Amino acid sequence: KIVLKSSDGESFEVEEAVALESQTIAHMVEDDNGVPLPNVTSKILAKVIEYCKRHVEMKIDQATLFELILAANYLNIKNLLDLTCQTVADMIKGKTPEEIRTTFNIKNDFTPEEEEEVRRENQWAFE
Amino acid sequence: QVVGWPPVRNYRK
Amino acid sequence: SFPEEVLEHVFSFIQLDKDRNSVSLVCKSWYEIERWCRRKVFIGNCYAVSPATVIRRFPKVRSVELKGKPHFADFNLVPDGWGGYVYPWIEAMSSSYTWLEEIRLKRMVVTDDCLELIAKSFKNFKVLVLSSCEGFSTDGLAAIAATCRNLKELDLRESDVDDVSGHWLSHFPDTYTSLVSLNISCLASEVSFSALERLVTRCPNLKSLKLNRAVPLEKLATLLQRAPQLEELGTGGYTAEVRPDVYSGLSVALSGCKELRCLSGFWDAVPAYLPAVYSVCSRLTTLNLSYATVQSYDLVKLLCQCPKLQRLWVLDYIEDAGLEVLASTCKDLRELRVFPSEPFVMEPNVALTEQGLVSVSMGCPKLESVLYFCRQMTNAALITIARNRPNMTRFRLCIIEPKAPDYLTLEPLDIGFGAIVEHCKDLRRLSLSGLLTDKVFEYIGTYAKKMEMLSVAFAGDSDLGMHHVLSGCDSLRKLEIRDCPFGDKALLANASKLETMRSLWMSSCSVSFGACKLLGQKMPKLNVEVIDERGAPDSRPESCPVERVFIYRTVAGPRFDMPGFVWNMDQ
Ligand SMILES: O=P(O)(O)O[C@H]1[C@H](OP(=O)(O)O)[C@@H](OP(=O)(O)O)[C@H](OP(=O)(O)O)[C@@H](OP(=O)(O)O)[C@H]1OP(=O)(O)O
Ligand SMILES: O=C(O)Cc1cccc2ccccc12
Incomplete structure (x- = not known):
């Protein structure tokens, strides 16, 4: 009873209660062709809908997780944002800065002198 | 005796 | 490539x-995102960093935990006035951390000005824990009580308070209902019992109430009737004329407390009233009998009722016989502390020896933390303990006479403690x-790779001993x-x-003073503090040993609040 259109221009039909799980959709609704969603792909909109259907009633890969969080944030779906953010946090826990920047493909931008000072402060003062 | 031995908080006798 | 708000989340x-x-x-x-959301x-060392540095780095802190004096302060080895003042931290937080909710302090000097400033600066203040603190009075407590409308926890664990008046507790307003934990067990002054009873009655989320000795046993049931939801209870005085009505009133009240998991207090406990607590014991996980001066058989009767016990603190009145019963009955025991009843008499006053500890090590499979004070020990006992409990994580053994050898072989206890560090791989x-040579420190250095804290007294032969520990641990x-032949060379x-x-x-x-100066020169990021009450150290030869030295890494540099008997060895 609500039609959502992905960035791919494909139409998804969902129950009103399912679409209103998104605060973003909720207020585009509180304004019919279909709710266009330029920042959410068909693949990920599908996953978001699965989630919202089930909760109205994460064994995915890294690249899909990163896109799912961005959608949950864009669509303002609080419970989904929590689950995905918890999953990413659990990738952080127990790990060294290097194992982290490895998992997340981040490059260290600290000058050796900067990182030394921060590490000394962390360990000496805050641990 | 020795000061602070045994290592307890008890008042002395 | 997450938006800032996503990473914050x-x-x-x-x-x-x-x-x-x-x-x-x-x-x-991540540095910048993390610091703006650290809660x-x-x-762990208040002098390792300055308040200004913490507040600049972490602007949104809601909970601060600070520790001051080192552990040996507990044994009068740190002279008064050494330091540990929290006022500079409160002063600094008072203008920046407007939303602060929790302050937990340990071994700090806390004044009434500090408490008055907390009360007036932090509107959402919820938790104050002062553990082994000193420097304040009931007047400071009254400021907290009067002003801190959202207070949930006031825990004065083992603090030294200036006991001006028990009237502070009357300053909690009638509108105040938020108390969850109150620990006043260190206070000498009697609070208004009517005030206390009205407070307990109006605080429905009260879960932990630890009283002082001045709440007499005959008034205890009255309070318990008002707080049947209690999870932790510290009794007040536990003595009264022996009467059926008092006993039955206490029995009924305690049995109405279904959620109690932790019991303590028992000052001046009379064996006649201890059975009142039995109905509670089936579910107890912590029992603190440190202040009860009752004899072995009375302790056994109680411990027999405690199959779920996880933590027991008891006096050596338990005896070897009592510990054998403990090892039989408390299969979930994780921690045992046996304190000395007469620590300052050399001849034993109780039949508590190494066998008690052997008994528990054999019978309690989850036992991983021990503090045990006794008068005799053997290497055979220590070896059997090590072999029985390879899961031991904290092991603290105090033989009351300094340098006592194995009483059966007269040998040092090197091999006994060497077995502990060899067999207990996760010992922290x-x-x-006891009698210990450099060899025990060689074992410690070789085997104790997870050890985080070591306390040593009257032990070893030469600098080799300290060198093995610093090199290997x-x-x-x-x-x-303390009191060991370790010095310049190992340091x-x-x-x-x-x-x-x-x-x-x-x-x-x-x-020597000379080595302290050199260490200070060499390591400018260490504070090397000579603490000596004989006056200026260079009024004596450089080779003269200092009374004490305390050395700690710091990003803040030398201290600004040293007394006249402390010198920092930097420039
Ligand atoms: O981690 P730390 O800062 O080194 O703290 C330790 C730790 O206490 P915390 O729970 O505050 O982390 C110990 O707890 P355990 O793991 O040994 O059970 C405690 O020992 P107690 O259990 O006897 O309370 C000990 O305190 P203490 O040194 O007074 O025995 C204390 O060390 P400090 O507070 O002295 O640094
Ligand atoms: O660990 C304890 O508290 C008791 C204790 C046991 C054994 C040696 C000690 C040395 C110094 C201080 C305390 C000590």
Whole structure:
């Protein structure tokens, strides 16, 4: 009873209660062709809908997780944002800065002198 | 005796 | 490539200090996001950093934990006025951390001005824990009571309070209902019982109530009737004329407390009233009988009722016989502390020996933390303990006579403690005593790779002993030493080790003023503090040993609040 259109221009039909799980959709609704969603792909909109259907009633890969969080944030779906953010946090826990920047493909931008000072402060003062 | 031995908080006798 | 608000939200699920620290180091972006959302700060040495530095780095802190004086302060080895003042931290937080909710302090000097400033600065203040603190009075407590409308926890664990008047407790207003935990067990002054009874009645979320000795046993049932939801109870006085009505009133009240898991207090306990507590014992997980002066058989009767016990603190009145019964009945025991009833008499007053500890090590499969005070020990006992409990994580053994050998063989206890460090691979804390040579420190250095805290007294032969520990103990964080023949050589040879540790305390050892000056020169990021009440150290030869030296790494540099008997060895 609500039609959502992905960035791919494909139409998804969902129950009103399912679409209103998104605060973003909720207020585009509180304004019919279909709710266009330029920042959410068909693949990920599908996953978001699965989630919202089930909760109205994460064994995915890294690249899909990163896109799912961005959608949950864009669509303002609080419970989904929590689950995905918890999953990413659990990738952080127990790990060294290097194992982290490895998992997340981040490059260290600290000058050796900067990182030394921060590490000394962390360990000496805050641990 | 020795000061602070045994290592307890008890008042002395 | 997450938006800032998304990373802030990932980080909200990461609350361990070590995880937060590791996050702050992945990249510059994370450094800044992490610091703006860190909720709690744990500062294990108040002089390792300045308040201004903490507040600038972490602007949104809601919970601060600070520790001041080192552990040996507990045994009168740190003179009064050494330091540990929290006022500069409160003064600094008062203008910046408007939303602060929790302050937990340990071994700090806390004044009424500090307490008055907390009350007036922090509107959402919820938790104050003062553990082994000193410097304040009931007047400061009255300011907290009067003003802190959202207070949930007021815990004065083992603090030394100036007991001006019990009237402070009357300052909690009638509109105040938020109390969850109240621990006033260290207060000498009697509070208004009517005020206390009205307070307990109007605080429905009260879960922990630990009284002082001045609440007499005959008034206890009245309070318990008002708080049947209690999970932890510290009794007041536990003595009264022996009467059926008093006993039955106490029995009924205690049996109405279904959620009690922790019991303590028992000052001046009379065996006649201890059975009142039995109905509670089936579910108890912590029992603190440290202040009860009752005899072995009375303790056994109680402990027989406690199959779920996980933590027991008891006096050596338990005896070897009582510990054999404990080993039989408390299969979930994780921690045992046996304190001395007459620590200052040399001849034993109780039949508590090494066998008690052997009994528990054999019978209690989850036993991983022991503090045990006795008058005799053997290597055979220590070896059997080590072999029985390879899961031991904290082992603290105090033989009351300094340098007592194995009483059966007259040998040092080196091999006994060597078995402990060899067999207990996850041992994080050790204190040892008895006759000990450098060889025990060789074992410690070889085997104790997870040991974080070591306490040593009247032990070893030469600097080799301290050198083995500093050289070999990979995980070492705190080392505290008294009355040992350790000095300049081991300290200087291992100077870089000290930057990996919270602190090193050495008192009545052989460390010369000359070595302290050199160590201070060499290691400008250490504060090397000579603490000596004989006046200026250079009024004596450079070779003269100092009374005490306390060494700790710091990013703040020398202290601004040293007394006249403390000197820092920097320039
Ligand atoms: O981690 P630390 O800062 O080194 O703290 C330790 C730890 O206490 P915390 O729970 O505050 O982390 C010990 O707890 P355990 O793991 O040994 O059970 C405690 O020992 P107690 O259990 O006897 O309370 C000990 O305190 P203490 O040194 O007074 O025995 C205390 O060390 P400090 O507070 O002295 O640094
Ligand atoms: O660990 C304890 O508290 C008791 C204790 C046991 C054994 C040796 C000690 C040395 C110094 C301080 C305390 C000590």
